[PDB]
Enzyme design. Structure first.
Site, PDB file in Angstrom:
ATOM      1  N   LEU A  17      -5.403   1.828  10.651  1.00 10.85           N
ATOM      2  CA  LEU A  17      -6.469   2.807  10.033  1.00 10.85           C
ATOM      3  C   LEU A  17      -6.721   1.973   8.685  1.00 10.85           C
ATOM      4  O   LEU A  17      -6.075   1.611   7.831  1.00 10.85           O
ATOM      5  CB  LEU A  17      -5.747   4.117   9.673  1.00 10.85           C
ATOM      6  CG  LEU A  17      -6.863   5.159   9.383  1.00 10.85           C
ATOM      7  CD1 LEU A  17      -7.675   5.347  10.497  1.00 10.85           C
ATOM      8  CD2 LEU A  17      -5.911   6.482   8.822  1.00 10.85           C
ATOM      9  N   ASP A  18      -8.135   1.483   8.723  1.00 13.14           N
ATOM     10  CA  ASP A  18      -8.650   0.988   7.517  1.00 13.14           C
ATOM     11  C   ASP A  18      -9.584   1.839   6.631  1.00 13.14           C
ATOM     12  O   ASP A  18     -10.321   2.168   7.228  1.00 13.14           O
ATOM     13  CB  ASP A  18      -9.464  -0.466   8.173  1.00 13.14           C
ATOM     14  CG  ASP A  18     -10.154  -1.021   7.003  1.00 13.14           C
ATOM     15  OD1 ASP A  18      -9.911  -1.935   6.263  1.00 13.14           O
ATOM     16  OD2 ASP A  18     -11.654  -0.572   6.855  1.00 13.14           O
ATOM     17  N   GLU A  69      -7.558  -8.027   9.386  1.00 16.86           N
ATOM     18  CA  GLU A  69      -8.822  -7.689   8.517  1.00 16.86           C
ATOM     19  C   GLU A  69      -9.747  -8.882   8.788  1.00 16.86           C
ATOM     20  O   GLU A  69     -10.829  -8.557   9.308  1.00 16.86           O
ATOM     21  CB  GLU A  69      -8.564  -7.212   7.165  1.00 16.86           C
ATOM     22  CG  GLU A  69      -7.587  -5.876   7.125  1.00 16.86           C
ATOM     23  CD  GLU A  69      -7.290  -5.546   5.771  1.00 16.86           C
ATOM     24  OE1 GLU A  69      -7.514  -4.267   5.573  1.00 16.86           O
ATOM     25  OE2 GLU A  69      -7.060  -6.165   4.846  1.00 16.86           O
ATOM     26  N   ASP A 109      -2.266   6.849   8.744  1.00 16.11           N
ATOM     27  CA  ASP A 109      -1.762   5.561   8.814  1.00 16.11           C
ATOM     28  C   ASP A 109      -0.433   5.518   9.968  1.00 16.11           C
ATOM     29  O   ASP A 109      -0.408   4.556  10.841  1.00 16.11           O
ATOM     30  CB  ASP A 109      -1.002   5.010   7.491  1.00 16.11           C
ATOM     31  CG  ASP A 109      -2.213   4.331   6.550  1.00 16.11           C
ATOM     32  OD1 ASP A 109      -1.959   4.661   5.158  1.00 16.11           O
ATOM     33  OD2 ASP A 109      -3.251   3.834   6.950  1.00 16.11           O
ATOM     34  N   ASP A 123       0.820  -1.167  -0.008  1.00 22.05           N
ATOM     35  CA  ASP A 123      -0.220  -0.027  -0.071  1.00 22.05           C
ATOM     36  C   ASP A 123       0.917   1.406   0.093  1.00 22.05           C
ATOM     37  O   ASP A 123       2.077   1.228   0.464  1.00 22.05           O
ATOM     38  CB  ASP A 123      -1.106   0.246   1.406  1.00 22.05           C
ATOM     39  CG  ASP A 123      -1.872  -0.839   1.177  1.00 22.05           C
ATOM     40  OD1 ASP A 123      -2.187  -1.788   0.185  1.00 22.05           O
ATOM     41  OD2 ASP A 123      -2.571  -1.392   2.278  1.00 22.05           O
ATOM     42  N   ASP A 131      -5.245  -3.490  12.433  1.00 23.12           N
ATOM     43  CA  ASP A 131      -5.135  -2.421  11.135  1.00 23.12           C
ATOM     44  C   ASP A 131      -5.236  -1.063  11.986  1.00 23.12           C
ATOM     45  O   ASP A 131      -6.328  -0.735  12.239  1.00 23.12           O
ATOM     46  CB  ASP A 131      -6.206  -2.634  10.104  1.00 23.12           C
ATOM     47  CG  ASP A 131      -6.185  -2.018   8.893  1.00 23.12           C
ATOM     48  OD1 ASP A 131      -7.171  -2.422   7.990  1.00 23.12           O
ATOM     49  OD2 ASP A 131      -5.422  -1.028   8.881  1.00 23.12           O
ATOM     50  N   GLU A 173      -0.616  -4.106  10.144  1.00 23.64           N
ATOM     51  CA  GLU A 173      -0.595  -3.905   8.892  1.00 23.64           C
ATOM     52  C   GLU A 173       0.592  -3.005   8.212  1.00 23.64           C
ATOM     53  O   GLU A 173       1.276  -3.329   7.343  1.00 23.64           O
ATOM     54  CB  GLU A 173      -1.738  -3.276   8.508  1.00 23.64           C
ATOM     55  CG  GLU A 173      -1.627  -2.591   6.813  1.00 23.64           C
ATOM     56  CD  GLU A 173      -2.781  -1.902   6.313  1.00 23.64           C
ATOM     57  OE1 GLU A 173      -3.762  -1.288   7.158  1.00 23.64           O
ATOM     58  OE2 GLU A 173      -2.852  -1.621   5.082  1.00 23.64           O
ATOM     59  N   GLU A 174       1.180  -2.181   9.177  1.00 21.73           N
ATOM     60  CA  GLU A 174       2.200  -1.132   8.986  1.00 21.73           C
ATOM     61  C   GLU A 174       3.656  -1.568   9.186  1.00 21.73           C
ATOM     62  O   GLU A 174       4.559  -0.884   8.767  1.00 21.73           O
ATOM     63  CB  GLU A 174       1.940   0.422   9.554  1.00 21.73           C
ATOM     64  CG  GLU A 174       0.572   0.850   9.092  1.00 21.73           C
ATOM     65  CD  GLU A 174       0.120   0.803   7.779  1.00 21.73           C
ATOM     66  OE1 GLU A 174       1.223   1.198   6.989  1.00 21.73           O
ATOM     67  OE2 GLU A 174      -0.811   0.452   7.171  1.00 21.73           O
TER      68      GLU A 174
END
Ligand SMILES: O=P(O)(O)OC[C@H]1O[C@](O)(CO)[C@@H](O)[C@@H]1O
Ligand SMILES: [Mg+2]
Ligand SMILES: [Mg+2]
Ligand SMILES: [Mg+2]
Length: 329
Positions: A114-115, A274, A68, A62, A112, A91-92
């Site tokens: 920020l989704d 997620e 984020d 991404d 996550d 996620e990051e």
């Protein structure tokens, strides 16, 4: 206003006859703090210049936005300070984060921060997704402690930064919704023991991928548009933020779909932070969550950044689609 049923009280009252160290309460109190901080930043993002990109790419490749980075930092700092965690998956971050021994606790947290990043700049609903595991093994904390099947979840849920801010929390006996009171910065119980309808009348998917869809998805959609028994066609909704589309599925009923397709064998959405949390919410609300061929919560992960197809929502809806995949098997 004098008797406040906050998330903290909820998560203390119930787990009081269950005993426990009470570090779950510590975990969730800590997480609520990050979520409040993320909500307030989001509600003022353009004035604070928080829109835009960070100038980086994550392991799922991404494009990383500014919120984020901010939201990722807050979740990590508050979880470490909670003294309730030992392994963190975000996620990051390429690799799992191992908490320093001094602040370790028994939980593993996948999240996550920020989704819905494609919807950040247009002010559409965004959110935060988390799943919580107990560390099993006795050996030193490692990424492997995060590679558990979703059925091993002790708690999971999401924060939705929508028209209001809501904390949706699923634990072993059920789902409860807590709304953020911005006046006192407390999550207040608003929906108790939420159950999803057996069948809905909304389907949610990005039909922009129609050319890549497998025959079963293709058939199902056609059927939603042209029902064989002359029932009313289903309404369509696709916000484009998994947390908003799943939340509507939860409270309105229906189905949400991010299937595998000809160019993505494993779908897009990420299993650990997620698909598993939302599958768990769905099953605790009495709904289902499938890849089209197996229950998401039963998948055993091998990669913390692993993708999975997900189809979830109302049991009779998801079951109709599973029958079509079966038929096509
Ligand atoms: O643009 P697409 O391919 O429909 O992806 C939308 C999905 O991607 C995500 O942004 C991944 O975070 C989800 O929140 C959302 O459900
Ligand atoms: Mg992203
Ligand atoms: Mg997301
Ligand atoms: Mg994200």
């Amino acid at each position: 206003d004098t008797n406040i049923v906050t998330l903290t009280r909820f998560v203390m009252e119930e787990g009081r006859k269950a005993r426990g160290t009470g570090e779950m309460t510590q975990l969730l109190n800590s997480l609520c703090t990050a979520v409040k901080a993320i909500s307030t930043a989001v509600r003022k993002a353009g004035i604070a210049h928080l829109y835009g990109i960070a100038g980086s790419t994550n392991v799922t490749g991404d494009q990383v936005k500014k919120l984020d980075v901010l939201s990722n930092d807050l979740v990590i700092n508050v979880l470490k300070s909670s003294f309730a965690t030992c392994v963190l998956v975000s996620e990051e971050d390429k690799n799992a984060i191992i908490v320093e021994p001094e602040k370790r606790g028994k939980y593993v947290v996948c999240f996550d921060p920020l989704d819905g990043s494609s919807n950040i700049d247009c002010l559409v609903s965004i959110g935060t997704i988390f799943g919580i595991y107990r560390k099993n093994s006795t050996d030193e904390p490692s990424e492997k402690d995060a590679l558990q099947p979703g059925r091993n979840l002790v708690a999971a849920g999401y924060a939705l930064y929508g028209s209001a801010t809501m904390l949706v929390l699923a634990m072993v006996n059920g789902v409860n919704c807590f709304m953020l009171d911005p006046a006192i910065g407390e999550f207040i119980l608003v929906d108790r023991d939420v159950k999803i309808k057996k069948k809905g009348s909304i389907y949610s998917i990005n039909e922009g991928y129609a050319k890549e869809f497998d025959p079963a998805i293709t058939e199902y959609i056609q059927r939603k548009k042209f029902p064989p028994d002359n029932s009313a066609p289903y309404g369509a909704r696709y916000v484009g933020s998994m947390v908003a589309d799943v939340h509507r599925t939860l409270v309105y009923g229906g189905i949400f779909m991010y299937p595998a397709n000809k160019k993505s064998p494993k779908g897009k959405l990420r299993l650990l932070y997620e698909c598993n949390p939302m599958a768990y919410v769905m099953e605790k609300a009495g709904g289902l969550a499938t890849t089209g061929k197996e229950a998401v919560l039963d998948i055993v992960p091998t990669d913390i950044h692993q993708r999975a197809p997900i189809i979830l929502g109302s049991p009779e809806d998801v079951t109709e689609l599973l029958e079509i995949y079966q038929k096509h098997a």
